[PDB]
Structure 1
């Protein structure tokens, strides 16, 4: 299958959207990752995809181009190919070192800072959505649940993303909207915990039990592997159940663990 300048080759991943496939550009001798969406599965989307194409940061996966036959179902988003794939899948048998987790936390924070400066909240930060670049740095991927906002923050009502990474305020009977940036800090906190432990801080196969744990249980650090008191401090501030006091990106950047 040829799609303009790309030869579509084998599948490398699948989802609710559709698939991701290798796309060979012969005129460049470069492979790409082509995300093939179904329009029936998805007006407003065309505008959101156009915002995503404007994004340019070393810790955000670059959307190269969009191909579309309006008379047909498929929508093709062409991205940079990162052949090392997701940095981690949870749960896993062996986590990263604390030192390695730090380099990846720095990447995510810089990427997130950049997205928030561009008035985007990601809403699905998690290890499997962090692609490992050939330069050793992670790039934030999967913007399917992201939202653009105006002003200083997103104000949100609906829940979206991955249950195990959703902040308490997003799943609580608030009768009130919640701030989108603090959702991304929380999710990054869950992610950070996954980097050093290989498992989420709140785990349950039963969604109501998962929600209860997220809302009601404190973070419990496994006795092994041991981590630094400084990392524990950062994780507890990022997983503060109160979004009003939960640490922000500016302070995360100044945290002693991050700067050490």
Structure 2
């Protein structure tokens, strides 16, 4: 809108870096393309957690929904790329994982799922903080509106109609692995290639490890049966505390997969700290 100056595209819709003409505040403006939707979204303006981006305004006008967010200068994807020749230091990996779990524990405690966690638009600042952003909430609310599948939980790929909070733990597990190894864990190019990449690493799931998998909507008895690989190939040289946590985040059965609250108690975080990243802006 004419309410904002210096509108600069930076990435459901387009996201711009903008300056509020009145206040001089620099913000992130998402342009998308419902009474319940407006009220549900607006409830989130009043919720507050250090590891979730602040939602400042909601605006339904024209055929458009604008969401105005606090502005952070970089995301985890850019930082991962910048750090690819050296790797992110393990204390900083650990701090970011811990903070992202704190943010998820909070939104799951309010019965909200992110649904589209990925390194992109996980927002970071110079103070060491990381924040959940770019939620996949339009569909879950009454909002009428190429896809990266690398972080999608297997129950989503198998057509489950009712996601649980466990889908976000899966995605975060994939991000954790990618921070450690500097390569995407499951880089699929289609829904079935995504599924089969998971199966080739973690083994084709069956009723022993995932009760009910063979009744999922898109499950096919014709799926190839791959044996589970050596887990020590997956995230070398991560230590056994880290590998243990990761394996619990990547359990096939959503009922067995670790919760955010329980993950925070895992021994991996006993020595957690909050280091300062080296950011070039």
Superposed pair shares fold, TM > 0.5: yes
Deviation at residue 226 of structure 1 after TM alignment: 1.7
Stretches of 4+ aligned residues off by more than 6 angstroms: 146-149
Higher relative contact order (CA 8 A, sep 6+): 2
The answer to which structure has the higher strand fraction is 1
**Pairwise CA distance, 1:45:** 3.8
Quote the residue 1:104 is aligned against.
96
What is the CA RMSD across the aligned residues, in angstroms? 2.7
Quickly say closer, same or farther: Cα 1:26–1:233, change in 2 above 3 A.
same
Aligned with 1:244 (options 255, 268, 272) = 255
Q: Deviations over 1:227-249 (max 9, x none)?
A: 21211111111111122222222
Distance 1:113 1:49 in 2: 19
| Alpha-carbon distance in structure 2 between the residues aligned to 1:208 and 1:233 | 27
Could you tell me how far 1:147 is from its partner in structure 2? 7.3
1:212 pairs, out of 180, 185, 196, with: 196
CA shift digits 1:165-209 (9 cap, x unpaired): 122222226xx6555111111111111111112222222334322
Q: Distance in 2 between matches of 1:169 and 1:223?
A: 21
2:71 is aligned, of 68, 81, 86, to 81
Q: Secondary structure, in 3 states, of the residue corresponding to 2:255? A: coil
Determine which of 8, 30, 35 is the counterpart of 2:30. Answer: 35
- Structure 2 residue aligned with 1:10, among 1, 8, 11? 8
Alignment of 1:1-260 (within 5 A): 2-3=2-3, 6-13=4-11, 17-38=12-33, 43=34, 45-69=37-61, 72-83=62-73, 85-89=74-78, 92=81, 93-94=84-85, 95-145=87-137, 162-172=148-158, 177-218=161-202, 220=231, 222=233, 226-260=237-271
The Cα shift of 1:52 comes to 3.1
Paired residues in the alignment total 235
TM-score, structure 2 as length reference:
0.74
**Which segments of 5 or more consecutive residues in structure 2 lack a partner in the other structure?**
142-146, 203-228, 272-281
Residue 102 of structure 1 and its aligned partner are, at CA, apart by 0.3
Q: Is the 8 A contact 1:90 1:127 kept in 2?
A: no
Structure 1 residue 139: Cα displacement: 0.5
- For 2:235 and 2:250, how far apart are their aligned partners in 1? 20
Q: In the superposition, relative to structure 1, how do residues 106 and 78 fare at CA in structure 2: closer, same or farther (>3 Å)?
A: same
What per-residue deviation string (whole Å, max 9, x for no partner) do you get for residues 114-154 of structure 1? Answer: 101111011112211310034221100012337779xxxxx
Greater CA deviation, 112-121 or 44-53? 44-53
Give the corresponding residue for 2:274: none
- TM-score w.r.t. the length of structure 1 is 0.79
Deviates more, 1:102-111 or 1:198-207: 198-207
Distance 2:270 2:261 in 1: 12
1:155 matched residue in structure 2:
none
